[PDB]
Amino acid sequence: MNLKDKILGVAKELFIKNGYNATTTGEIVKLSESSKGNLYYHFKTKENLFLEILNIEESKWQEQWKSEQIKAKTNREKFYLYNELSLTTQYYYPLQNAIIEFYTEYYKTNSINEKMNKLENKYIDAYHVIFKEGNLNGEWSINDVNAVSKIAANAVNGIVTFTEQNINERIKLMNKFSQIFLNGLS
Amino acid sequence: LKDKILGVAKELFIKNGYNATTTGEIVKLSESSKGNLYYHFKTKENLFLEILNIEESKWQEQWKSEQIKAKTNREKFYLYNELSLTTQYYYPLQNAIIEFYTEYYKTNSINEKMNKLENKYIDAYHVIFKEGNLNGEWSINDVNAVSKIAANAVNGIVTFTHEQNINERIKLMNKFSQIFLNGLS
Ligand SMILES: CC[n+]1c(-c2ccccc2)c2cc(N)ccc2c2ccc(N)cc21
């Protein structure tokens, strides 16, 4: 509906620019020329709207990587390439601040917390594959891929989120990191 | 004095967070007025930044003290990372800082002042690596880039690790430290 995807996009950008709390359902309903009833009928609650957006963001990113990893022969390159993509992509990573702001608040309520761990698993799994495969084709030796994946992901999210900033300078930084990390596995 | 408003402000931010905390509450509980506040700290965000600075100073003190127990710079690195994780695990202001950051991490006035604050945390890393270069523990050409990489990555691990059990968090953080220094060699 031109009244469904209409509110989804407005919510996305707002959550990206002002975070979760600052973004009120009212303003969303405002800039998206709709009613509190529409938002309600389509998303019920504000927190529900946010999880749906995270659900979509997770898919897009998943698809984008699914078709981008092919361009990298060795997993060592898929590592470099994945980290660089997370810098330029428009999916998921641009919403980290809001995600953490949301996670910390409703982490007690296990209802939606469970939902986020599910979204948290996929975003991590990407690294799992890279390292698991790297083991199979003898590119490196990692006894605990689960630990290395978690470390890599969060470490990277850190560079992406905490580092306007010159897009080229960021990539050189991300590559440097990528190099240092992989040479540490060896 | 102006210390009264700051004291109360931190408590409210700790208790109810940054967004829920209004300048009004800070006013009445401090026996002051919105006027005297606008005078001393201009805006709310500026007050919160004034509290973070003071906090940073306390952090420097903690580091200044704790760091003397790490003989080599390679040990300081491990220590600094683990200490960030644990200290921030039970640090009250954490949630309030999370909100503020995710809110004003895109404001020319507050961003410049924010980066200046984060840079002091990053600079700790600059010392360790520079000292390490001299002390023959390693050899890093661009310390500035490497310190930013270490700092933001460590912060990532500390911030996005949605996993529980503090025992596991320290393990992963120690592992990162090993992996990271192992790659600088
Ligand atoms: C929680 C404060 N804080 C921030 C920080 C995060 C967001 C805004 C400002 C500073 C930080 C930011 C970067 N990049 C690197 C290290 C730290 C850090 C390190 C230790 C600590 N004990 C607090 C730390």
Author numbering:
A (entry chain B): 1 to 163, 165 to 187
B (entry chain A): 3 to 187
Article passage:
QacR represses transcription of the qacA multidrug efflux transporter gene by binding as a pair of dimers to the IR1 DNA operator sequence, a large inverted repeat that overlaps the qacA promoter (PqacA). Drug binding occurs with a stoichiometry of one drug per QacR dimer and elicits a coil-to-helix transition of residues T89 through Y93 in the ligand-bound subunit resulting in the expulsion of Y92 and Y93 from the interior of the protein and the formation of the multidrug-binding pocket. The QacR multidrug-binding pocket contains two distinct but partially overlapping binding sites designated the rhodamine 6G (R6G) and ethidium (Et) sites after their respectively bound drugs.
Structures of QacR(E90Q) and QacR(E120Q) bound to Et, Dq, MG and R6G were solved to 2.8 Å, 3.3 Å, 2.2 Å and 2.9 Å resolution, or 3.3 Å, 2.9 Å, 2.4 Å and 3.2 Å resolution respectively. By contrast, QacR(E90Q) and QacR(E120Q) in complex with Et and MG crystallized in the hexagonal space group P62. Structural comparison of the hexagonal QacR mutant-drug complexes with the corresponding tetragonal wt QacR-drug complex revealed a new QacR conformation (with global RMSDs of ∼2.0 Å between all corresponding Cα atoms) in which notably, residues 89 through 93 had undergone the coil-to-helix transition, the structural hallmark of drug-mediated induction. Although charge neutralization of Et was ascribed solely to E120 in the wt QacR-drug complex, the location of Et in the QacR(E90Q)-Et structure is dramatically altered. In this QacR(E90Q)-Et complex, Et is angled at 120° relative to its wt orientation and shifted toward the R6G sub-pocket, hence overlapping the Et and R6G sub-pockets and taking a position that is comparable to that occupied by MG. Lost are van der Waals contacts with the side chains of I99 and I100 and aromatic stacking interactions with F162′ and Y103, the latter residue shifting from a position that would have clashed with Et in the QacR(E90Q)-Et structure. Nevertheless, Et gains stacking interactions with W61 and van der Waals contacts with S86, M116 and N154. Indeed, in the QacR(E90Q)-Et structure, the side chain of E120, despite remaining within 4 Å of the Et phenanthridinium ring system, is repositioned to avoid a clash with the drug, shifting by 3.0 Å so that it is no longer available to charge complement the Et N5 nitrogen atom (E120-N5 distance  = 4.0 Å in the wt QacR-Et complex and 7.0 Å in the QacR(E90Q)-Et complex).
